[PDB]
Short mmCIF file of C-alpha atoms and ligand atoms in Angstrom, two decimals:
data_model
loop_
_atom_site.label_atom_id
_atom_site.label_comp_id
_atom_site.label_asym_id
_atom_site.label_seq_id
_atom_site.Cartn_x
_atom_site.Cartn_y
_atom_site.Cartn_z
CA UNK A 1 22.97 -0.42 -0.12
CA UNK A 2 24.85 -3.49 0.64
CA UNK A 3 23.48 -4.25 4.56
CA UNK A 4 25.87 -3.29 7.08
CA UNK A 5 27.82 -5.65 9.43
CA UNK A 6 28.30 -4.10 13.01
CA UNK A 7 30.85 -5.79 14.69
CA UNK A 8 30.98 -5.24 18.71
CA UNK A 9 34.09 -3.49 19.48
CA UNK A 10 35.30 -3.60 23.30
CA UNK A 11 35.49 -0.08 24.91
CA UNK A 12 39.57 0.00 25.41
CA UNK A 13 40.90 -1.61 28.16
CA UNK A 14 37.40 -2.36 29.78
CA UNK A 15 36.12 -5.51 31.47
CA UNK A 16 33.57 -7.03 33.92
CA UNK A 17 34.25 -4.60 36.59
CA UNK A 18 33.98 -1.25 34.47
CA UNK A 19 30.52 -1.98 33.52
CA UNK A 20 29.69 -3.39 37.18
CA UNK A 21 30.77 0.25 38.16
CA UNK A 22 28.02 1.81 35.34
CA UNK A 23 25.40 -0.68 36.08
CA UNK A 24 25.79 0.23 39.97
CA UNK A 25 26.04 4.17 39.02
CA UNK A 26 22.15 3.35 37.65
CA UNK A 27 21.19 1.35 40.10
CA UNK A 28 21.97 4.06 42.76
CA UNK A 29 20.59 6.82 40.85
CA UNK A 30 17.44 4.45 40.23
CA UNK A 31 17.44 4.56 44.02
CA UNK A 32 17.87 8.08 44.73
CA UNK A 33 15.37 9.61 42.19
CA UNK A 34 12.36 7.38 43.12
CA UNK A 35 10.01 10.57 43.42
CA UNK A 36 9.75 10.45 39.45
CA UNK A 37 6.47 9.48 37.97
CA UNK A 38 4.62 9.81 41.29
CA UNK A 39 7.28 7.45 42.99
CA UNK A 40 7.13 4.92 40.42
CA UNK A 41 10.85 5.56 39.81
CA UNK A 42 12.86 6.01 36.59
CA UNK A 43 13.09 2.23 36.25
CA UNK A 44 9.94 1.27 33.47
CA UNK A 45 11.25 4.25 31.51
CA UNK A 46 15.19 3.07 31.17
CA UNK A 47 13.73 -0.64 30.02
CA UNK A 48 11.42 0.97 27.33
CA UNK A 49 14.05 3.13 26.56
CA UNK A 50 16.10 0.34 25.65
CA UNK A 51 13.40 -1.49 23.95
CA UNK A 52 12.66 1.37 21.66
CA UNK A 53 16.24 2.32 20.93
CA UNK A 54 16.74 -1.45 19.84
CA UNK A 55 13.58 -1.78 18.38
CA UNK A 56 14.11 0.15 15.30
CA UNK A 57 15.71 -2.60 13.97
CA UNK A 58 15.18 -4.00 10.44
CA UNK A 59 16.41 -7.58 9.88
CA UNK A 60 16.30 -7.67 6.05
CA UNK A 61 18.87 -4.47 6.08
CA UNK A 62 20.56 -4.35 9.37
CA UNK A 63 19.45 -0.88 9.53
CA UNK A 64 18.65 0.40 13.07
CA UNK A 65 19.36 -1.23 16.25
CA UNK A 66 21.03 -0.51 19.35
CA UNK A 67 24.34 -0.85 18.02
CA UNK A 68 24.58 3.09 16.88
CA UNK A 69 22.78 4.48 19.91
CA UNK A 70 21.13 6.61 17.20
CA UNK A 71 18.92 7.95 19.76
CA UNK A 72 21.28 10.94 20.88
CA UNK A 73 20.17 12.44 17.18
CA UNK A 74 16.99 14.78 17.24
CA UNK A 75 15.56 12.71 14.07
CA UNK A 76 15.10 9.68 16.43
CA UNK A 77 15.05 11.54 19.88
CA UNK A 78 11.77 13.12 18.38
CA UNK A 79 9.85 10.52 16.98
CA UNK A 80 6.49 10.77 18.30
CA UNK A 81 6.75 7.01 19.18
CA UNK A 82 9.49 8.06 21.63
CA UNK A 83 7.64 10.54 23.54
CA UNK A 84 8.36 10.37 27.24
CA UNK A 85 11.89 8.48 26.41
CA UNK A 86 13.61 12.02 27.26
CA UNK A 87 13.17 11.79 30.60
CA UNK A 88 15.53 8.44 30.43
CA UNK A 89 17.78 9.81 28.52
CA UNK A 90 17.88 12.99 30.85
CA UNK A 91 18.22 10.20 34.04
CA UNK A 92 21.16 8.55 31.71
CA UNK A 93 23.13 12.21 31.23
CA UNK A 94 24.85 12.06 34.62
CA UNK A 95 25.65 8.49 34.16
CA UNK A 96 27.14 9.14 31.11
CA UNK A 97 29.30 11.94 32.13
CA UNK A 98 30.62 10.19 34.84
CA UNK A 99 31.76 7.30 32.85
CA UNK A 100 32.57 9.36 29.09
CA UNK A 101 34.11 5.89 27.73
CA UNK A 102 31.01 3.77 27.09
CA UNK A 103 28.81 3.72 23.91
CA UNK A 104 25.68 5.29 23.91
CA UNK A 105 24.26 1.86 22.36
CA UNK A 106 25.62 0.40 25.67
CA UNK A 107 24.54 2.86 28.13
CA UNK A 108 20.89 3.13 26.68
CA UNK A 109 20.83 -0.86 26.87
CA UNK A 110 22.62 -1.70 29.85
CA UNK A 111 19.92 1.18 31.67
CA UNK A 112 17.21 -1.27 30.39
CA UNK A 113 19.15 -4.33 31.79
CA UNK A 114 19.85 -2.68 35.32
CA UNK A 115 16.17 -1.48 35.91
CA UNK A 116 14.96 -4.80 35.19
CA UNK A 117 17.43 -6.54 37.47
CA UNK A 118 17.02 -3.89 40.22
CA UNK A 119 12.78 -4.19 39.76
CA UNK A 120 13.68 -7.68 41.03
CA UNK A 121 13.25 -9.10 37.54
CA UNK A 122 15.53 -12.36 36.13
CA UNK A 123 19.13 -11.80 35.51
CA UNK A 124 19.47 -10.61 31.72
CA UNK A 125 23.33 -11.26 30.44
CA UNK A 126 24.57 -8.04 28.57
CA UNK A 127 27.88 -7.77 26.03
CA UNK A 128 29.21 -4.76 25.59
CA UNK A 129 30.60 -3.12 22.09
CA UNK A 130 28.03 -1.20 20.77
CA UNK A 131 29.95 1.56 18.80
CA UNK A 132 28.26 4.94 17.69
CA UNK A 133 27.41 5.66 14.63
CA UNK A 134 26.88 8.95 12.88
CA UNK A 135 23.95 10.86 12.31
CA UNK A 136 23.33 9.88 8.85
CA UNK A 137 22.63 6.27 10.15
CA UNK A 138 19.99 7.04 12.39
CA UNK A 139 16.82 4.99 11.34
CA UNK A 140 13.45 6.99 10.58
CA UNK A 141 10.47 7.65 12.08
CA UNK A 142 7.78 5.01 12.34
CA UNK A 143 9.66 1.68 12.99
CA UNK A 144 8.24 1.15 16.39
CA UNK A 145 4.58 -0.55 16.98
CA UNK A 146 1.36 1.37 17.17
CA UNK A 147 -1.06 0.02 20.06
CA UNK A 148 -4.20 0.34 18.47
CA UNK A 149 -4.06 -2.66 16.50
CA UNK A 150 -4.95 -6.49 16.67
CA UNK A 151 -2.71 -9.82 16.85
CA UNK A 152 -2.33 -10.16 13.27
CA UNK A 153 -0.36 -6.92 13.09
CA UNK A 154 1.74 -7.73 16.28
CA UNK A 155 2.80 -10.98 14.79
CA UNK A 156 3.38 -9.56 11.77
CA UNK A 157 5.30 -6.76 13.15
CA UNK A 158 7.68 -8.43 15.33
CA UNK A 159 8.61 -10.63 12.49
CA UNK A 160 10.69 -7.48 11.48
CA UNK A 161 12.67 -8.23 14.44
CA UNK A 162 13.18 -11.72 13.97
CA UNK A 163 10.67 -12.56 16.95
CA UNK A 164 8.27 -15.84 17.02
CA UNK A 165 4.80 -15.77 19.26
CA UNK A 166 6.74 -16.77 22.65
CA UNK A 167 9.66 -14.22 22.23
CA UNK A 168 6.47 -11.52 21.60
CA UNK A 169 4.20 -12.66 24.58
CA UNK A 170 7.34 -12.61 26.64
CA UNK A 171 8.52 -9.50 25.66
CA UNK A 172 5.01 -7.57 26.15
CA UNK A 173 5.13 -8.88 30.17
CA UNK A 174 7.45 -5.71 30.01
CA UNK A 175 4.35 -3.80 30.40
CA UNK A 176 4.34 -5.41 34.01
CA UNK A 177 6.14 -2.33 34.89
CA UNK A 178 5.08 1.79 34.36
CA UNK A 179 1.90 2.93 32.91
CA UNK A 180 0.86 4.76 29.83
CA UNK A 181 0.83 8.74 29.98
CA UNK A 182 -2.23 10.54 27.99
CA UNK A 183 0.04 13.22 27.07
CA UNK A 184 2.85 10.79 26.05
CA UNK A 185 0.84 8.05 23.68
CA UNK A 186 -3.06 8.97 24.00
CA UNK A 187 -3.53 6.09 26.37
CA UNK A 188 -3.90 6.48 30.19
CA UNK A 189 -3.39 4.32 33.07
CA UNK A 190 -0.99 1.75 34.86
CA UNK A 191 -1.24 -2.59 33.56
CA UNK A 192 -0.31 -3.68 36.91
CA UNK A 193 -0.48 -1.97 40.64
CA UNK A 194 3.26 -2.99 41.55
CA UNK A 195 4.60 -1.11 38.63
CA UNK A 196 7.98 -0.63 39.76
CA UNK A 197 8.01 -4.81 40.48
CA UNK A 198 9.28 -6.96 37.52
CA UNK A 199 7.13 -10.08 37.91
CA UNK A 200 3.92 -11.85 36.15
CA UNK A 201 1.06 -9.87 36.97
CA UNK A 202 0.84 -8.32 33.42
CA UNK A 203 -0.45 -12.08 32.77
CA UNK A 204 -2.56 -12.50 36.01
CA UNK A 205 -4.40 -9.08 34.92
CA UNK A 206 -5.02 -9.87 31.40
CA UNK A 207 -6.63 -13.16 32.07
CA UNK A 208 -8.18 -12.44 35.55
CA UNK A 209 -9.96 -8.81 35.40
CA UNK A 210 -12.96 -7.97 33.79
CA UNK A 211 -12.36 -5.90 31.00
CA UNK A 212 -14.70 -2.91 29.30
CA UNK A 213 -13.50 -1.43 26.17
CA UNK A 214 -13.95 2.23 26.37
CA UNK A 215 -12.61 5.65 25.59
CA UNK A 216 -10.04 7.91 27.26
CA UNK A 217 -9.67 11.34 27.25
CA UNK A 218 -7.65 11.36 24.26
CA UNK A 219 -10.57 9.64 22.48
CA UNK A 220 -8.59 6.47 22.07
CA UNK A 221 -10.30 2.68 22.89
CA UNK A 222 -8.21 1.03 26.07
CA UNK A 223 -9.69 -1.64 27.88
CA UNK A 224 -10.04 -0.75 31.33
CA UNK A 225 -10.95 -3.16 34.65
CA UNK A 226 -12.91 -1.78 38.17
CA UNK A 227 -9.42 -2.30 39.95
CA UNK A 228 -8.01 0.72 38.08
CA UNK A 229 -5.81 -1.15 35.13
CA UNK A 230 -5.53 -0.91 31.62
CA UNK A 231 -4.47 -2.85 28.35
CA UNK A 232 -3.91 -1.24 25.18
CA UNK A 233 -5.82 -3.07 22.16
CA UNK A 234 -2.13 -5.01 21.36
CA UNK A 235 -1.77 -6.20 24.79
CA UNK A 236 -5.80 -7.17 24.75
CA UNK A 237 -5.21 -9.03 21.37
CA UNK A 238 -2.59 -11.84 23.20
CA UNK A 239 -6.21 -12.83 24.33
CA UNK A 240 -7.86 -12.87 21.51
CA UNK A 241 -5.40 -14.86 19.54
CA UNK A 242 -5.87 -18.67 20.76
CA UNK A 243 -1.92 -18.92 19.67
CA UNK A 244 -0.76 -15.95 22.26
CA UNK A 245 -3.22 -17.28 24.76
CA UNK A 246 -1.82 -20.57 25.51
CA UNK A 247 1.63 -18.20 26.20
CA UNK A 248 -0.01 -15.79 28.64
CA UNK A 249 -1.81 -18.68 30.46
CA UNK A 250 1.91 -20.60 30.55
CA UNK A 251 3.21 -17.51 31.86
CA UNK A 252 0.57 -16.35 33.98
CA UNK A 253 1.02 -20.22 35.79
CA UNK A 254 4.73 -19.91 35.93
CA UNK A 255 7.03 -17.16 36.92
CA UNK A 256 10.36 -18.91 36.66
CA UNK A 257 9.48 -19.79 33.06
CA UNK A 258 8.55 -16.25 32.52
CA UNK A 259 11.31 -14.76 33.66
CA UNK A 260 13.55 -17.21 31.98
CA UNK A 261 12.03 -16.33 28.82
CA UNK A 262 11.82 -12.77 29.21
CA UNK A 263 15.66 -12.78 30.00
CA UNK A 264 16.26 -14.45 26.63
CA UNK A 265 14.54 -12.53 24.29
CA UNK A 266 15.40 -9.05 26.04
CA UNK A 267 18.92 -9.95 25.64
CA UNK A 268 18.17 -11.27 22.09
CA UNK A 269 16.44 -7.97 21.20
CA UNK A 270 18.96 -5.55 22.60
CA UNK A 271 21.95 -7.54 20.75
CA UNK A 272 19.91 -7.62 17.23
CA UNK A 273 22.22 -6.52 14.44
CA UNK A 274 25.43 -7.05 16.05
CA UNK A 275 28.09 -9.02 15.36
CA UNK A 276 30.39 -10.39 18.30
CA UNK A 277 33.80 -11.74 17.40
CA UNK A 278 34.50 -15.16 18.69
CA UNK A 279 37.63 -13.69 20.51
CA UNK A 280 34.67 -10.87 22.63
CA UNK A 281 34.35 -11.63 25.98
CA UNK A 282 31.45 -14.00 27.16
CA UNK A 283 27.94 -12.08 28.25
CA UNK A 284 28.32 -10.24 31.70
CA UNK A 285 25.81 -11.30 34.21
CA UNK A 286 25.97 -8.22 36.96
CA UNK A 287 24.90 -8.30 40.25
CA UNK A 288 22.12 -6.10 41.38
CA UNK A 289 23.05 -3.70 44.93
CA UNK A 290 21.19 -5.78 47.02
CA UNK A 291 23.67 -8.85 46.04
CA UNK A 292 26.91 -6.47 46.66
CA UNK A 293 25.11 -5.05 49.97
CA UNK A 294 25.24 -1.78 48.50
C1 LIG B 301 3.08 -4.08 20.29
C2 LIG B 301 4.06 -3.76 21.32
C3 LIG B 301 4.32 -2.61 22.09
C4 LIG B 301 3.50 -1.63 21.61
C5 LIG B 301 2.16 -1.12 20.92
C6 LIG B 301 3.81 -1.06 22.68
C7 LIG B 301 3.26 0.39 23.61
C8 LIG B 301 3.41 1.21 24.30
C9 LIG B 301 2.69 2.79 24.96
C10 LIG B 301 1.64 3.08 24.03
C11 LIG B 301 3.26 3.01 26.12
C12 LIG B 301 2.94 4.20 26.81
C13 LIG B 301 4.30 4.98 26.62
C14 LIG B 301 3.56 6.21 27.37
O1 LIG B 301 2.74 6.98 27.31
O2 LIG B 301 4.50 6.96 28.44
C15 LIG B 301 3.94 1.55 26.40
C16 LIG B 301 5.33 1.86 27.45
C17 LIG B 301 6.02 0.70 28.06
N1 LIG B 301 6.24 -0.34 27.54
FE1 LIG B 301 5.82 -0.81 25.64
N2 LIG B 301 4.55 -1.70 24.08
C18 LIG B 301 5.05 -2.94 23.23
C19 LIG B 301 5.93 -3.62 23.37
C20 LIG B 301 6.81 -3.22 24.57
C21 LIG B 301 8.00 -4.08 24.70
C22 LIG B 301 8.81 -5.28 24.17
C23 LIG B 301 8.76 -3.52 25.90
C24 LIG B 301 9.70 -3.91 26.50
C25 LIG B 301 10.79 -5.23 26.60
C26 LIG B 301 7.73 -2.43 26.63
C27 LIG B 301 7.87 -2.11 27.89
C28 LIG B 301 7.26 -0.70 27.94
C29 LIG B 301 7.71 0.11 29.66
C30 LIG B 301 8.65 -0.94 30.57
C31 LIG B 301 6.62 0.96 29.44
C32 LIG B 301 6.00 1.70 30.61
C33 LIG B 301 7.17 3.13 30.48
C34 LIG B 301 6.87 4.03 31.39
O3 LIG B 301 6.57 3.74 32.27
O4 LIG B 301 7.40 5.24 31.48
N3 LIG B 301 6.81 -2.53 25.40
N4 LIG B 301 4.06 0.65 25.63
K1 LIG B 302 4.29 -5.06 38.06
#
């Protein structure tokens, strides 16, 4: 099967203003629906949705990826690895209803960008142009990562997404948001206390907390700290591996570096598999509600 080329196609007549309006709608709803998940808000689940819809990509044949917006199809929607993401999708429904012109891929990815920025994270340049593809293009389940593995697994896994050591450690920093839910993944607990604030706390906790390898109620091992935080075996592997450890220490000691590196890696993640024409508009950098005085 010749590997497909997915060329970005700007939604007819749309420009920055249009997308800023969608961003604002998402941001306003994030502010409004703050009760979700014990007052954590929808920010974290939206970031996870953006990552999962993009993370199915395979550099070898360009299958999966954010372009097609295939999460809308049952096969992907029902992927066990996506348990819980239905919440993010339900949140996006009113947004898509108001702006029916935006593609699913653009909406899923924009939701992640909006959530990160609204949660005081770095600005993440974003490009429009993803086009909805048929149900038959939906990637099979099993392309997202397992959490009960080690550094070797993580390193190998991310090579399929064309991510190097630095990009992997930076991307994992997204765990500074939200928490694991036993019912969804078989893991329970937050990585950080301020889990709706995008900062480098994930790295600081990993390095400074006293972790104990314990078993949760789902009979799965996870690292727990007296402070009430947790780390998946894959998160902990970042301090077990010498190469990953140096980068963890770097981000734990440089907030700005983490922000810049995460911004680049997250945009790359959300753009994998997409060919942007030379005449395509430059990446958009949306203003937060706060910057707009809204
Ligand atoms: C080896 C890689 C990774 C593994 C094994 C992993 C695993 C997990 C697991 C098991 C959960 C809990 C889901 C639940 O129970 O609701 C989770 C949540 C989450 N992950 Fe990851 N993750 C990985 C990489 C990433 C990356 C690259 C990002 C994004 C840049 C990310 C963002 C999130 C966010 C924001 C949540 C919180 C969701 C919520 O609170 O609802 N993860 N991850
Ligand atoms: K945090």
